[PDB]
């Protein structure tokens, strides 16, 4: 029961969500693993963060 | 925590297993031929005509 979250989003006019778990959730997030990889150009470092 | 719109990113790593291909791209190998037959050593005339 935890890792389980849930993401909202509300414009002007339209609200919407997205869940991490149960009927909505991807495939992607169990058959594979994202990884946000934020890259200095000058110091040619990958500090690699974990995503969802 | 106010969770703002980032710009769109760079390009894309993909990270998978290779296959190694040291064992394959030998030479072959079939199965060996089963050999003709070949007339057994030995063979007589047993057979004698009568009289």
């Known amino acids: ?21 149960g009927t909505g959730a991807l495939k992607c997030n169990t058959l594979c693993r994202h990884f946000v990889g934020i890259l200095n150009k000058t110091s040619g470092q990958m500090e690699v963060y974990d995503a969802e | 925590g106010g969770l ?22 030998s030479p072959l190998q079939p199965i060996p031929a089963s050999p003709p037959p070949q007339i057994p050593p ?9 009289g």
């Not at chain 1, 029961?1 to 778990?21: C, H, M, P, W």
């Open chain 2, 4 to 25: 703002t719109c980032a710009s769109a990113p760079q390009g894309t790593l993909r990270i998978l297993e290779g296959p190694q291909q040291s064992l394959s791209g």
């Open chain 2, 42 to 50: 030995g063979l007589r005339p047993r057979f004698c005509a009568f």
């Open chain 1, 1 to 21: 029961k935890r890792n389980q979250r849930i993401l909202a989003a509300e414009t002007d006019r339209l609200s919407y969500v997205g869940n991490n778990f």
